Amino acid sequence: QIIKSIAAIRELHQMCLTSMGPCGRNKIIVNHLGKIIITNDAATMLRELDIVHPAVKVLVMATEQQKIDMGDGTNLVMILAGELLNVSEKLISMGLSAVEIIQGYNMARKFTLKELDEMVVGEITDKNDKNELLKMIKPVISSKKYGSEDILSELVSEAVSHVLPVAQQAGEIPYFNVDSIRVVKIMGGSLSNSTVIKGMVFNREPEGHVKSLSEDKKHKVAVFTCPLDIANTETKGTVLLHNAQEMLDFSKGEEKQIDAMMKEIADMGVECIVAGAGVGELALHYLNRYGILVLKVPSKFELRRLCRVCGATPLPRLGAPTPEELGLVETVKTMEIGGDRVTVFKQEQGEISRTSTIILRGATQNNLDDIERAIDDGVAAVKGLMKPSGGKLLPGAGATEIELISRITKYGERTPGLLQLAIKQFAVAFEVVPRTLAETAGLDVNEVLPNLYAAHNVTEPGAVKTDHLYKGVDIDGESDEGVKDIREENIYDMLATKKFAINVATEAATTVLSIDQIIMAKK
Amino acid sequence: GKGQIISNINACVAVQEALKPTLGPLGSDILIVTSNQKTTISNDGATILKLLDVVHPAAKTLVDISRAQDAEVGDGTTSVTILAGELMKEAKPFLEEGISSHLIMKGYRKAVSLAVEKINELAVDITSEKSSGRELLERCARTAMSSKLIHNNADFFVKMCVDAVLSLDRNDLDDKLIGIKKIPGGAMEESLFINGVAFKKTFSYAGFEQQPKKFNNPKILSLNVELELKAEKDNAEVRVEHVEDYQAIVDAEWQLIFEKLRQVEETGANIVLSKLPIGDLATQFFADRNIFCAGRVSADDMNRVIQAVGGSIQSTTSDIKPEHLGTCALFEEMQIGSERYNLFQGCPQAKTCTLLLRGGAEQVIAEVERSLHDAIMIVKRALQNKLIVAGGGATEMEVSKCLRDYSKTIAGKQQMIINAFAKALEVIPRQLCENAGFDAIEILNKLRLAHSKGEKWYGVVFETENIGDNFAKFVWEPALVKINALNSATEATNLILSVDETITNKG
Amino acid sequence: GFFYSSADQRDKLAASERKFVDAKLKKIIDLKNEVCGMDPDKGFVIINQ
């Protein structure tokens, strides 16, 4: 049954072989609601598909473990754990029990995780510079959207640097909230006209008669949760109709009261009123004559992030314009994005903001929708840089994979006993990573494999190789011959992603080998 | 698996095979039966493909590029779908030999980079050189009308086509601003151009034959509510406890209607437009006051009246403000079309017009209606876009030529891919000859002879079968078509070939 | 019921009911400074359900 369970996983394994890498294939997902979507990330595909088979549930639950704590490695945990079961087939047919196979991977896992600390090349200084963020974000954009890697590099790195404050050697105060970076898309135009602005972006239209405010800095903003209406009594206070004589007093009564309430509020100096609920017809006409911008925000989630930016606080009541709770904004205007004029929120060189929004433009919404998921995964890659050894990095694109194979085979001969068979098969399972990039790129697999081992195996006067550790697995697409160095384009995967993906894929692979029988009964 | 990619290619061929005869003005048309049972016949590939609603996922990709082709450009929706699927048809034997589809998809964008730089070299900017304002619109109008039954009557049709685009702003032009109403009966050469909007003469009620046909400066008013007393369908139930109150309520309902009637009388609006039918009480009262009223006005027809005289519709007859009224230059109801039709003429503020056509059958006029739309799209893109290239296969044959020589200078697998890309471009001129009935074997071979002699302007003559130059045939196309087609076809081809598995969830 | 003529008067009516809670709140903050108020390594936690 273990062999039969691998065959079912092998069908799922081949699905991820065409996923990882910039040359991979995308799969169309047709939802039961009549919506056709397509995405590169395999973790989204597992959510729309119903998982049943128990050996498949192990890799799916391990995939959700990769979604938290990081945004990269969704295809890494699936391909690595899937190959460990394929190389274990030779041990099962040989007659070796699956118990010692699991024990062999546990000994090789501790030797692998310990070597990753000594294989580090550079370390991120956490300078939060625009050029420093281009090294981490550029390889993350790759393998998802092709051709936008160089275009989206300057857009994502500039928006993240605005959220990240200026600090050094301080790990006590947490930062980098997930919702602080919002990605919106507008149909039409292209990515060349996209810029990076500090503030929230609203897609609602300026229903008020004031399209844009003045150029004076520090405009007060009043966030009102209670809708605009005549002041009522907290106890009962239900308006009832009796005779036609009282009908004239209802319209004339609310006309003077609403005009008097907005009067004193507008006289406090606040030029912007944010109403989280519906706005009345009579109350809208009064604020338009006083030069007050009316902005409705029905979403309660957008009002929470605004408190940390402008400084305003939502008031559950109406008619109490407290100046201590008012915020400040330099410029509030209405710009036309993609043909539609929407009121935006921004500031210049003041009142530092922890929340930013990226404005994107594109002709085709299909590929543009995947850009939002690619940037959201790129934002989560910034989380990989933390105080507990977050700045450590390793060369990617198959450079570390093949180089680690030669170091594992050295530990195999040094460890006596039956563990030698498990150590050798553990290093061979890493050959799926270079073959994945070589097969999806159209290059000959038999040509690339010997050229890799020839670069990683050299004769030097010493036990530590010096000159070139940077030889990777290159996607050529060129005419004749030659490759590129990892340090040239700075395309690599961080250590926090690789160390976490291998540790989870190792336990997930040994978990499938533990269950040799399934039993289903009525609950 | 590899069989799923091949199966997705053959699924796009069935959709492409239907759109092949629709390429060209003389090509065949697709007959689609909608679920609503309404039958529509048109040669425009946009509306056609939108009615398929194919469940297959790769067929939806051709729909997305068709909407962008109709939005940003508006012309060439048929050719962009054929070219997007042709690259997958020629790449079918390439996948059987073991060549990965990635290098095939990457090789397409390599030729596009050389094609974009080629369009700029073939783009010639000319406006006032060897031409004028009237001669530019007159010579280009007879080209789209060629090979049609209107070619003999095209002398009167070009004069109306030039004045159609001159009645609108030259910076912003829209083909929807010119309306076309099919009028059965009458000669086809007796049609005229109208600046305003016309009605359908739906009035079945007595009182006709009495009306002046010429107004000086009438006032136009739009009313959103109907005014009637006793209709021809419903009735009124009046039940009271008094005998003398029976006639009182009947007279009371007459006074409530007469209220809103005399309010318009004090305003003095000679034209009354309402989306709801008007009873016989208002039509009889307005006869002595020389006030015209039109009931059951279409929604799309009344919306164009707002942009015509600059007025607006009001709910009641009480609070109507003076700026809602409007006045035209002349109002004339003629016998054109063997029926009396009323229409507006001489509106200086009108942002829309209507072009009336006549003919023995409505289906024959529909063929002329779609033929006039092709001449409007040429003028629409000739104003904003100053780059004009030779169409009708001229530029298409030039792109394939130069790419064949670039393959010999590029070593590697890209030699056979670019050569196959240029070979796949031959489907556009082929199908144009196969639709009209020309021989694809002789013409395509005879065209490649002089095409290599250094002259890049050689096109395909659509009138008499022969090789020739489209510059003398006055066949022109904007440079935006060639740029948007190559970008939409490459993106659609690379998207379908990149799908190795079709996942469909049911529930 | 709470009847307020102006917006500033409503805050006095809302604080009137809270004054009953604030009366018990002042005894809580004063108990911390009464016993070992200035002594180091002293704090107070509210476990109120």
PDB file of all heavy atoms in Angstrom, chain B residues 398-419:
ATOM      1  N   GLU B 398       4.780  41.387 -45.789  1.00  0.00           N
ATOM      2  CA  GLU B 398       6.096  41.969 -45.545  1.00  0.00           C
ATOM      3  C   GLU B 398       6.697  41.460 -44.241  1.00  0.00           C
ATOM      4  O   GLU B 398       7.912  41.247 -44.155  1.00  0.00           O
ATOM      5  CB  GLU B 398       6.002  43.495 -45.533  1.00  0.00           C
ATOM      6  CG  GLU B 398       7.329  44.197 -45.279  1.00  0.00           C
ATOM      7  CD  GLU B 398       8.341  43.986 -46.390  1.00  0.00           C
ATOM      8  OE1 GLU B 398       7.947  43.562 -47.496  1.00  0.00           O
ATOM      9  OE2 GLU B 398       9.541  44.239 -46.151  1.00  0.00           O
ATOM     10  N   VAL B 399       5.865  41.261 -43.216  1.00  0.00           N
ATOM     11  CA  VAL B 399       6.373  40.786 -41.934  1.00  0.00           C
ATOM     12  C   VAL B 399       6.939  39.378 -42.070  1.00  0.00           C
ATOM     13  O   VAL B 399       7.968  39.046 -41.471  1.00  0.00           O
ATOM     14  CB  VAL B 399       5.266  40.857 -40.865  1.00  0.00           C
ATOM     15  CG1 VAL B 399       5.755  40.273 -39.548  1.00  0.00           C
ATOM     16  CG2 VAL B 399       4.805  42.293 -40.676  1.00  0.00           C
ATOM     17  N   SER B 400       6.288  38.532 -42.872  1.00  0.00           N
ATOM     18  CA  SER B 400       6.759  37.162 -43.038  1.00  0.00           C
ATOM     19  C   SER B 400       8.063  37.111 -43.829  1.00  0.00           C
ATOM     20  O   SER B 400       8.930  36.277 -43.548  1.00  0.00           O
ATOM     21  CB  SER B 400       5.683  36.319 -43.723  1.00  0.00           C
ATOM     22  OG  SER B 400       6.131  34.992 -43.938  1.00  0.00           O
ATOM     23  N   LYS B 401       8.209  37.986 -44.827  1.00  0.00           N
ATOM     24  CA  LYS B 401       9.412  37.995 -45.655  1.00  0.00           C
ATOM     25  C   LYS B 401      10.666  38.211 -44.816  1.00  0.00           C
ATOM     26  O   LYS B 401      11.548  37.346 -44.758  1.00  0.00           O
ATOM     27  CB  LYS B 401       9.298  39.072 -46.736  1.00  0.00           C
ATOM     28  CG  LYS B 401      10.482  39.104 -47.693  1.00  0.00           C
ATOM     29  CD  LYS B 401      10.336  40.203 -48.731  1.00  0.00           C
ATOM     30  CE  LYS B 401      10.431  41.577 -48.092  1.00  0.00           C
ATOM     31  NZ  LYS B 401      11.772  41.821 -47.494  1.00  0.00           N
ATOM     32  N   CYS B 402      10.767  39.376 -44.169  1.00  0.00           N
ATOM     33  CA  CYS B 402      11.993  39.747 -43.467  1.00  0.00           C
ATOM     34  C   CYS B 402      12.357  38.749 -42.373  1.00  0.00           C
ATOM     35  O   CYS B 402      13.545  38.518 -42.119  1.00  0.00           O
ATOM     36  CB  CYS B 402      11.853  41.150 -42.877  1.00  0.00           C
ATOM     37  SG  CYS B 402      11.665  42.461 -44.108  1.00  0.00           S
ATOM     38  N   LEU B 403      11.361  38.151 -41.717  1.00  0.00           N
ATOM     39  CA  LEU B 403      11.649  37.189 -40.659  1.00  0.00           C
ATOM     40  C   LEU B 403      12.258  35.898 -41.192  1.00  0.00           C
ATOM     41  O   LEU B 403      12.909  35.177 -40.429  1.00  0.00           O
ATOM     42  CB  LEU B 403      10.380  36.879 -39.863  1.00  0.00           C
ATOM     43  CG  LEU B 403       9.810  38.042 -39.048  1.00  0.00           C
ATOM     44  CD1 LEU B 403       8.485  37.655 -38.413  1.00  0.00           C
ATOM     45  CD2 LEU B 403      10.805  38.495 -37.990  1.00  0.00           C
ATOM     46  N   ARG B 404      12.065  35.592 -42.476  1.00  0.00           N
ATOM     47  CA  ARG B 404      12.698  34.409 -43.049  1.00  0.00           C
ATOM     48  C   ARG B 404      14.203  34.598 -43.202  1.00  0.00           C
ATOM     49  O   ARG B 404      14.963  33.632 -43.075  1.00  0.00           O
ATOM     50  CB  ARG B 404      12.067  34.071 -44.400  1.00  0.00           C
ATOM     51  CG  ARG B 404      10.608  33.653 -44.316  1.00  0.00           C
ATOM     52  CD  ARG B 404      10.016  33.425 -45.697  1.00  0.00           C
ATOM     53  NE  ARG B 404      10.667  32.323 -46.399  1.00  0.00           N
ATOM     54  CZ  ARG B 404      10.405  31.980 -47.656  1.00  0.00           C
ATOM     55  NH1 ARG B 404       9.501  32.653 -48.354  1.00  0.00           N
ATOM     56  NH2 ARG B 404      11.046  30.962 -48.215  1.00  0.00           N
ATOM     57  N   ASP B 405      14.648  35.827 -43.471  1.00  0.00           N
ATOM     58  CA  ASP B 405      16.077  36.090 -43.599  1.00  0.00           C
ATOM     59  C   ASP B 405      16.763  36.194 -42.243  1.00  0.00           C
ATOM     60  O   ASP B 405      17.955  35.884 -42.134  1.00  0.00           O
ATOM     61  CB  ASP B 405      16.306  37.372 -44.403  1.00  0.00           C
ATOM     62  CG  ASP B 405      15.939  37.215 -45.864  1.00  0.00           C
ATOM     63  OD1 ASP B 405      15.800  36.062 -46.324  1.00  0.00           O
ATOM     64  OD2 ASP B 405      15.790  38.245 -46.555  1.00  0.00           O
ATOM     65  N   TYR B 406      16.039  36.625 -41.207  1.00  0.00           N
ATOM     66  CA  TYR B 406      16.629  36.729 -39.879  1.00  0.00           C
ATOM     67  C   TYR B 406      16.895  35.366 -39.253  1.00  0.00           C
ATOM     68  O   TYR B 406      17.727  35.268 -38.345  1.00  0.00           O
ATOM     69  CB  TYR B 406      15.725  37.552 -38.959  1.00  0.00           C
ATOM     70  CG  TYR B 406      15.554  38.991 -39.388  1.00  0.00           C
ATOM     71  CD1 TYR B 406      14.325  39.629 -39.275  1.00  0.00           C
ATOM     72  CD2 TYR B 406      16.622  39.718 -39.899  1.00  0.00           C
ATOM     73  CE1 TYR B 406      14.162  40.945 -39.664  1.00  0.00           C
ATOM     74  CE2 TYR B 406      16.469  41.035 -40.291  1.00  0.00           C
ATOM     75  CZ  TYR B 406      15.238  41.643 -40.171  1.00  0.00           C
ATOM     76  OH  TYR B 406      15.080  42.954 -40.558  1.00  0.00           O
ATOM     77  N   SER B 407      16.208  34.317 -39.713  1.00  0.00           N
ATOM     78  CA  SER B 407      16.437  32.988 -39.160  1.00  0.00           C
ATOM     79  C   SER B 407      17.806  32.451 -39.556  1.00  0.00           C
ATOM     80  O   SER B 407      18.461  31.763 -38.765  1.00  0.00           O
ATOM     81  CB  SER B 407      15.333  32.033 -39.616  1.00  0.00           C
ATOM     82  OG  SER B 407      15.354  31.865 -41.024  1.00  0.00           O
ATOM     83  N   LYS B 408      18.256  32.758 -40.775  1.00  0.00           N
ATOM     84  CA  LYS B 408      19.560  32.284 -41.225  1.00  0.00           C
ATOM     85  C   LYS B 408      20.697  32.926 -40.440  1.00  0.00           C
ATOM     86  O   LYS B 408      21.776  32.335 -40.320  1.00  0.00           O
ATOM     87  CB  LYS B 408      19.729  32.555 -42.720  1.00  0.00           C
ATOM     88  CG  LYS B 408      18.775  31.767 -43.604  1.00  0.00           C
ATOM     89  CD  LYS B 408      18.932  32.153 -45.066  1.00  0.00           C
ATOM     90  CE  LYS B 408      17.993  31.350 -45.952  1.00  0.00           C
ATOM     91  NZ  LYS B 408      18.093  31.762 -47.380  1.00  0.00           N
ATOM     92  N   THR B 409      20.478  34.124 -39.901  1.00  0.00           N
ATOM     93  CA  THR B 409      21.491  34.817 -39.119  1.00  0.00           C
ATOM     94  C   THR B 409      21.431  34.486 -37.634  1.00  0.00           C
ATOM     95  O   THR B 409      22.312  34.922 -36.883  1.00  0.00           O
ATOM     96  CB  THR B 409      21.358  36.334 -39.302  1.00  0.00           C
ATOM     97  OG1 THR B 409      20.053  36.754 -38.886  1.00  0.00           O
ATOM     98  CG2 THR B 409      21.565  36.714 -40.761  1.00  0.00           C
ATOM     99  N   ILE B 410      20.427  33.735 -37.193  1.00  0.00           N
ATOM    100  CA  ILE B 410      20.264  33.370 -35.790  1.00  0.00           C
ATOM    101  C   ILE B 410      20.470  31.866 -35.676  1.00  0.00           C
ATOM    102  O   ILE B 410      19.652  31.076 -36.166  1.00  0.00           O
ATOM    103  CB  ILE B 410      18.890  33.787 -35.247  1.00  0.00           C
ATOM    104  CG1 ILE B 410      18.762  35.311 -35.235  1.00  0.00           C
ATOM    105  CG2 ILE B 410      18.676  33.221 -33.852  1.00  0.00           C
ATOM    106  CD1 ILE B 410      17.364  35.803 -34.933  1.00  0.00           C
ATOM    107  N   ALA B 411      21.561  31.467 -35.029  1.00  0.00           N
ATOM    108  CA  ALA B 411      21.857  30.060 -34.822  1.00  0.00           C
ATOM    109  C   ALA B 411      21.019  29.495 -33.679  1.00  0.00           C
ATOM    110  O   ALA B 411      20.562  30.218 -32.788  1.00  0.00           O
ATOM    111  CB  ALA B 411      23.344  29.858 -34.535  1.00  0.00           C
ATOM    112  N   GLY B 412      20.821  28.183 -33.712  1.00  0.00           N
ATOM    113  CA  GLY B 412      20.064  27.496 -32.686  1.00  0.00           C
ATOM    114  C   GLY B 412      18.667  27.122 -33.140  1.00  0.00           C
ATOM    115  O   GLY B 412      18.307  27.201 -34.319  1.00  0.00           O
ATOM    116  N   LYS B 413      17.866  26.699 -32.159  1.00  0.00           N
ATOM    117  CA  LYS B 413      16.501  26.264 -32.436  1.00  0.00           C
ATOM    118  C   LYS B 413      15.607  27.401 -32.914  1.00  0.00           C
ATOM    119  O   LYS B 413      14.541  27.136 -33.477  1.00  0.00           O
ATOM    120  CB  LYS B 413      15.891  25.624 -31.188  1.00  0.00           C
ATOM    121  CG  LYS B 413      16.562  24.332 -30.755  1.00  0.00           C
ATOM    122  CD  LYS B 413      15.955  23.812 -29.462  1.00  0.00           C
ATOM    123  CE  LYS B 413      16.609  22.513 -29.024  1.00  0.00           C
ATOM    124  NZ  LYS B 413      16.064  22.028 -27.726  1.00  0.00           N
ATOM    125  N   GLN B 414      16.015  28.654 -32.703  1.00  0.00           N
ATOM    126  CA  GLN B 414      15.198  29.790 -33.111  1.00  0.00           C
ATOM    127  C   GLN B 414      15.114  29.948 -34.623  1.00  0.00           C
ATOM    128  O   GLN B 414      14.268  30.713 -35.100  1.00  0.00           O
ATOM    129  CB  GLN B 414      15.741  31.077 -32.486  1.00  0.00           C
ATOM    130  CG  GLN B 414      15.621  31.124 -30.971  1.00  0.00           C
ATOM    131  CD  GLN B 414      16.212  32.387 -30.376  1.00  0.00           C
ATOM    132  OE1 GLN B 414      17.078  33.023 -30.976  1.00  0.00           O
ATOM    133  NE2 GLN B 414      15.747  32.757 -29.189  1.00  0.00           N
ATOM    134  N   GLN B 415      15.957  29.251 -35.386  1.00  0.00           N
ATOM    135  CA  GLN B 415      15.884  29.340 -36.841  1.00  0.00           C
ATOM    136  C   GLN B 415      14.611  28.690 -37.368  1.00  0.00           C
ATOM    137  O   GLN B 415      13.895  29.278 -38.188  1.00  0.00           O
ATOM    138  CB  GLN B 415      17.120  28.696 -37.471  1.00  0.00           C
ATOM    139  CG  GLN B 415      17.172  28.817 -38.985  1.00  0.00           C
ATOM    140  CD  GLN B 415      18.478  28.316 -39.566  1.00  0.00           C
ATOM    141  OE1 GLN B 415      19.401  27.961 -38.832  1.00  0.00           O
ATOM    142  NE2 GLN B 415      18.562  28.279 -40.891  1.00  0.00           N
ATOM    143  N   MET B 416      14.310  27.474 -36.908  1.00  0.00           N
ATOM    144  CA  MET B 416      13.108  26.781 -37.347  1.00  0.00           C
ATOM    145  C   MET B 416      11.840  27.348 -36.724  1.00  0.00           C
ATOM    146  O   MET B 416      10.760  27.205 -37.309  1.00  0.00           O
ATOM    147  CB  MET B 416      13.213  25.288 -37.027  1.00  0.00           C
ATOM    148  CG  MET B 416      14.297  24.561 -37.806  1.00  0.00           C
ATOM    149  SD  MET B 416      14.439  22.824 -37.344  1.00  0.00           S
ATOM    150  CE  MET B 416      15.801  22.308 -38.385  1.00  0.00           C
ATOM    151  N   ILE B 417      11.942  27.984 -35.557  1.00  0.00           N
ATOM    152  CA  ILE B 417      10.763  28.545 -34.907  1.00  0.00           C
ATOM    153  C   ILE B 417      10.335  29.838 -35.589  1.00  0.00           C
ATOM    154  O   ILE B 417       9.147  30.049 -35.861  1.00  0.00           O
ATOM    155  CB  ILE B 417      11.037  28.760 -33.406  1.00  0.00           C
ATOM    156  CG1 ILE B 417      11.279  27.417 -32.716  1.00  0.00           C
ATOM    157  CG2 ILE B 417       9.876  29.492 -32.751  1.00  0.00           C
ATOM    158  CD1 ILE B 417      11.791  27.543 -31.298  1.00  0.00           C
ATOM    159  N   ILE B 418      11.293  30.721 -35.876  1.00  0.00           N
ATOM    160  CA  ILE B 418      10.972  31.966 -36.566  1.00  0.00           C
ATOM    161  C   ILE B 418      10.514  31.684 -37.991  1.00  0.00           C
ATOM    162  O   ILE B 418       9.593  32.334 -38.502  1.00  0.00           O
ATOM    163  CB  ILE B 418      12.179  32.922 -36.530  1.00  0.00           C
ATOM    164  CG1 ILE B 418      12.467  33.360 -35.093  1.00  0.00           C
ATOM    165  CG2 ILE B 418      11.937  34.136 -37.415  1.00  0.00           C
ATOM    166  CD1 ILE B 418      13.770  34.113 -34.934  1.00  0.00           C
ATOM    167  N   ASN B 419      11.138  30.706 -38.652  1.00  0.00           N
ATOM    168  CA  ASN B 419      10.701  30.326 -39.991  1.00  0.00           C
ATOM    169  C   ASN B 419       9.288  29.760 -39.966  1.00  0.00           C
ATOM    170  O   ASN B 419       8.506  29.976 -40.900  1.00  0.00           O
ATOM    171  CB  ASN B 419      11.676  29.315 -40.596  1.00  0.00           C
ATOM    172  CG  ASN B 419      11.416  29.066 -42.069  1.00  0.00           C
ATOM    173  OD1 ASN B 419      10.940  29.946 -42.785  1.00  0.00           O
ATOM    174  ND2 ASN B 419      11.730  27.860 -42.528  1.00  0.00           N
TER     175      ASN B 419
END
